[PDB]
Amino acid sequence: SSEVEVVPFQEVWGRSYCRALERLVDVVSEYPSEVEHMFSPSCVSLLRCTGCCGDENLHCVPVETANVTMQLLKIRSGDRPSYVELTFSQHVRCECRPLR
Amino acid sequence: SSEVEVVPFQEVWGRSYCRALERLVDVVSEYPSEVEHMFSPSCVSLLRCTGCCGDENLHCVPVETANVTMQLLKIRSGDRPSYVELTFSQHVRCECRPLR
């Protein structure tokens, strides 16, 4: 009864090995340059390549990307709230490759 | 059309609202103090409360935690590789609450 399940090494490794994983990211952070924090929600759910690779010199990178357009509330100090449509980058498939 | 789908505000908000989300985390950083990166995989998949709360004053926190025991490979410069069972903290349910 006090004995817990152990996730086997193969599963552990496979679960955390490089993949397109849903992550919640700060909207403003997705912008190239500084941009005032006037978005609601302030964070969105995007698929981003994540994972370790086992090989030190290797890291998880996208081999295929796409797009997702989301409707957010823009709240700038000086204007009336307004909805806007923003297209964000999506990472569809990932693979371990040579960092640099 | 050549028209793309727009994820409506309600869905966007709900998707990024405080929740227990699978995240890949560095094993060593789950340790209180400094530990040598002697684990393989170096990162594991854990449920972690993540999300924005519509208010800078509120933050996503767990209201329920649990455990997951995983089998990893310990590799120390000096010992022969060896499998070990590591128990990690799991976040089961999450909620937005006042900062600190």
Tab-separated table of C-alpha atoms in Angstrom:
chain	number	residue	atom	x	y	z
A	1	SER	CA	0.000	0.000	0.000
A	2	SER	CA	2.900	2.310	0.845
A	3	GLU	CA	4.627	1.155	-2.371
A	4	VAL	CA	4.657	3.714	-5.164
A	5	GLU	CA	4.985	3.255	-8.901
A	6	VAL	CA	8.399	3.905	-10.449
A	7	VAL	CA	8.479	5.440	-13.900
A	8	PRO	CA	11.077	3.280	-15.833
A	9	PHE	CA	14.179	4.960	-17.274
A	10	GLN	CA	13.044	4.502	-20.890
A	11	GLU	CA	9.764	6.294	-20.184
A	12	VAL	CA	11.468	9.039	-18.214
A	13	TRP	CA	13.928	9.658	-21.050
A	14	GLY	CA	11.283	9.514	-23.745
A	15	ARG	CA	8.927	11.859	-21.881
A	16	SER	CA	11.546	14.595	-21.496
A	17	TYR	CA	13.282	14.079	-24.811
A	18	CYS	CA	13.010	16.946	-27.285
A	19	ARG	CA	9.481	17.776	-28.402
A	20	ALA	CA	6.899	20.427	-29.275
A	21	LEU	CA	5.511	21.143	-25.805
A	22	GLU	CA	2.674	23.490	-24.822
A	23	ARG	CA	4.172	26.325	-22.815
A	24	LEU	CA	2.646	29.540	-21.444
A	25	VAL	CA	4.607	32.522	-22.673
A	26	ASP	CA	4.533	36.221	-21.910
A	27	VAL	CA	2.995	38.058	-24.879
A	28	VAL	CA	5.263	41.087	-24.572
A	29	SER	CA	8.270	38.719	-24.531
A	30	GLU	CA	7.270	37.466	-27.997
A	31	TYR	CA	7.797	40.930	-29.395
A	32	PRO	CA	11.202	41.776	-30.938
A	33	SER	CA	11.739	44.990	-28.967
A	34	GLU	CA	10.382	46.566	-25.743
A	35	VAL	CA	6.597	46.871	-25.854
A	36	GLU	CA	4.398	48.004	-22.950
A	37	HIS	CA	2.595	45.275	-20.980
A	38	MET	CA	-0.869	46.103	-22.286
A	39	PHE	CA	-2.216	42.657	-23.147
A	40	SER	CA	-4.864	40.487	-21.590
A	41	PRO	CA	-4.267	37.742	-20.929
A	42	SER	CA	-0.635	38.720	-20.411
A	43	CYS	CA	0.482	35.196	-21.350
A	44	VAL	CA	-0.589	32.779	-24.075
A	45	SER	CA	-0.281	29.024	-24.731
A	46	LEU	CA	2.128	28.195	-27.612
A	47	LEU	CA	3.893	24.986	-28.697
A	48	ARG	CA	7.612	25.484	-28.143
A	49	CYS	CA	10.447	23.014	-28.686
A	50	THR	CA	11.626	21.840	-25.313
A	51	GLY	CA	13.625	18.957	-23.968
A	52	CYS	CA	17.082	17.791	-23.139
A	53	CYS	CA	19.039	15.699	-25.624
A	54	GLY	CA	21.461	13.582	-23.615
A	55	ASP	CA	24.340	14.770	-25.787
A	56	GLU	CA	25.903	17.871	-24.169
A	57	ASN	CA	26.609	19.596	-27.501
A	58	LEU	CA	23.001	18.987	-28.609
A	59	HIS	CA	19.860	20.996	-27.903
A	60	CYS	CA	16.204	20.890	-28.974
A	61	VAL	CA	15.331	22.935	-32.052
A	62	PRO	CA	12.311	23.236	-34.364
A	63	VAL	CA	12.420	21.489	-37.738
A	64	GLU	CA	8.980	22.841	-38.587
A	65	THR	CA	7.056	25.948	-37.479
A	66	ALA	CA	3.638	27.346	-38.170
A	67	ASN	CA	1.320	30.129	-36.950
A	68	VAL	CA	-1.602	30.672	-34.607
A	69	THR	CA	-3.710	33.852	-34.554
A	70	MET	CA	-5.231	34.692	-31.183
A	71	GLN	CA	-7.687	37.399	-30.080
A	72	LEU	CA	-6.471	39.341	-27.056
A	73	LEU	CA	-7.534	42.431	-25.157
A	74	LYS	CA	-5.227	45.362	-25.689
A	75	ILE	CA	-5.196	47.802	-22.695
A	76	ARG	CA	-2.966	50.755	-23.271
A	77	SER	CA	-2.677	53.483	-20.646
A	78	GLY	CA	-4.337	56.185	-22.720
A	79	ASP	CA	-6.842	54.348	-24.904
A	80	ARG	CA	-10.080	52.480	-24.319
A	81	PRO	CA	-9.699	48.684	-24.071
A	82	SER	CA	-9.895	47.070	-27.499
A	83	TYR	CA	-9.607	43.533	-28.903
A	84	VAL	CA	-6.771	42.777	-31.318
A	85	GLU	CA	-5.715	39.756	-33.353
A	86	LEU	CA	-2.109	38.710	-32.933
A	87	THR	CA	-0.308	36.003	-34.885
A	88	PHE	CA	2.195	34.059	-32.865
A	89	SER	CA	4.853	31.544	-33.841
A	90	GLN	CA	4.154	27.843	-33.264
A	91	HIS	CA	6.817	25.064	-33.211
A	92	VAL	CA	5.173	22.037	-34.855
A	93	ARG	CA	8.057	19.480	-34.778
A	94	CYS	CA	11.365	19.460	-32.974
A	95	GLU	CA	14.677	17.633	-33.104
A	96	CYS	CA	17.997	17.579	-31.310
A	97	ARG	CA	20.775	19.340	-33.272
A	98	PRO	CA	24.339	20.920	-32.906
A	99	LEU	CA	24.238	24.037	-30.831
A	100	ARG	CA	26.471	26.955	-31.772
B	1	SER	CA	-10.400	30.696	-47.440
B	2	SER	CA	-6.851	31.583	-47.444
B	3	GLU	CA	-8.445	32.714	-44.204
B	4	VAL	CA	-6.897	31.598	-40.907
B	5	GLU	CA	-8.751	30.667	-37.726
B	6	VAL	CA	-8.747	33.178	-34.873
B	7	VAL	CA	-8.751	31.706	-31.393
B	8	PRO	CA	-11.459	33.734	-29.562
B	9	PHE	CA	-10.608	35.740	-26.432
B	10	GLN	CA	-12.455	33.383	-24.096
B	11	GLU	CA	-10.504	30.339	-25.301
B	12	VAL	CA	-7.204	32.202	-25.297
B	13	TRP	CA	-7.801	33.332	-21.718
B	14	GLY	CA	-8.875	29.903	-20.518
B	15	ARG	CA	-5.969	28.139	-22.184
B	16	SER	CA	-3.411	30.293	-20.367
B	17	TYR	CA	-5.249	30.644	-17.097
B	18	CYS	CA	-3.635	29.132	-14.028
B	19	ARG	CA	-3.286	25.361	-14.385
B	20	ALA	CA	-1.102	22.322	-13.590
B	21	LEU	CA	0.934	22.085	-16.793
B	22	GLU	CA	3.469	19.461	-17.893
B	23	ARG	CA	6.850	21.172	-17.911
B	24	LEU	CA	10.351	19.775	-18.530
B	25	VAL	CA	12.558	20.685	-15.553
B	26	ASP	CA	16.291	20.366	-14.841
B	27	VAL	CA	16.820	17.590	-12.279
B	28	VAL	CA	19.657	19.343	-10.445
B	29	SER	CA	17.581	22.537	-9.990
B	30	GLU	CA	14.941	20.449	-8.172
B	31	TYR	CA	17.563	19.874	-5.512
B	32	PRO	CA	17.722	22.324	-2.603
B	33	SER	CA	21.483	22.906	-2.714
B	34	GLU	CA	24.130	22.630	-5.438
B	35	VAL	CA	24.482	19.128	-6.876
B	36	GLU	CA	26.684	17.864	-9.711
B	37	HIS	CA	24.862	17.410	-13.026
B	38	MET	CA	25.162	13.650	-12.718
B	39	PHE	CA	21.725	12.678	-14.023
B	40	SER	CA	20.478	11.262	-17.287
B	41	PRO	CA	18.133	12.452	-18.590
B	42	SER	CA	19.195	15.836	-17.217
B	43	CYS	CA	15.584	17.047	-17.298
B	44	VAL	CA	12.315	15.389	-16.290
B	45	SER	CA	8.659	16.017	-17.127
B	46	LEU	CA	6.733	17.298	-14.072
B	47	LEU	CA	3.333	18.957	-13.538
B	48	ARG	CA	3.970	22.532	-12.438
B	49	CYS	CA	1.384	25.261	-11.730
B	50	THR	CA	1.699	27.785	-14.495
B	51	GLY	CA	-0.483	30.539	-15.812
B	52	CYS	CA	-1.325	34.197	-15.638
B	53	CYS	CA	-4.158	35.447	-13.416
B	54	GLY	CA	-5.471	38.602	-15.086
B	55	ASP	CA	-3.960	40.546	-12.182
B	56	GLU	CA	-0.295	41.384	-11.505
B	57	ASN	CA	-1.120	41.094	-7.801
B	58	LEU	CA	-2.255	37.459	-8.132
B	59	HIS	CA	-0.078	34.492	-9.057
B	60	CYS	CA	-0.741	30.846	-9.879
B	61	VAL	CA	0.001	28.511	-6.970
B	62	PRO	CA	-0.652	24.882	-6.142
B	63	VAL	CA	-3.604	23.976	-3.887
B	64	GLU	CA	-2.602	20.338	-4.068
B	65	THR	CA	0.744	18.582	-4.624
B	66	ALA	CA	1.743	14.950	-4.920
B	67	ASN	CA	4.757	12.777	-5.796
B	68	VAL	CA	6.188	10.932	-8.769
B	69	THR	CA	9.122	8.516	-8.419
B	70	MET	CA	11.325	8.246	-11.495
B	71	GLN	CA	14.219	5.980	-12.458
B	72	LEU	CA	17.211	7.937	-13.669
B	73	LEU	CA	20.787	7.099	-14.542
B	74	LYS	CA	23.350	8.566	-12.174
B	75	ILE	CA	26.684	9.291	-13.855
B	76	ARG	CA	29.523	10.586	-11.676
B	77	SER	CA	33.072	11.129	-12.894
B	78	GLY	CA	34.569	8.533	-10.564
B	79	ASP	CA	31.794	5.944	-10.178
B	80	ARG	CA	30.327	3.478	-12.703
B	81	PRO	CA	26.969	4.563	-14.171
B	82	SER	CA	24.104	3.458	-11.937
B	83	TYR	CA	20.279	3.720	-12.013
B	84	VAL	CA	18.577	5.503	-9.132
B	85	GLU	CA	15.008	6.147	-8.077
B	86	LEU	CA	14.245	9.828	-7.533
B	87	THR	CA	11.001	11.184	-6.095
B	88	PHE	CA	9.908	14.560	-7.386
B	89	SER	CA	7.232	17.020	-6.315
B	90	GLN	CA	4.159	17.025	-8.530
B	91	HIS	CA	1.588	19.847	-8.737
B	92	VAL	CA	-1.918	18.341	-9.002
B	93	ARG	CA	-4.277	21.355	-8.861
B	94	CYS	CA	-3.565	25.048	-9.089
B	95	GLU	CA	-5.233	28.348	-8.253
B	96	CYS	CA	-4.597	32.063	-8.473
B	97	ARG	CA	-3.843	33.724	-5.105
B	98	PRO	CA	-2.338	36.979	-3.694
B	99	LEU	CA	1.385	37.469	-4.292
B	100	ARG	CA	3.400	36.212	-1.312
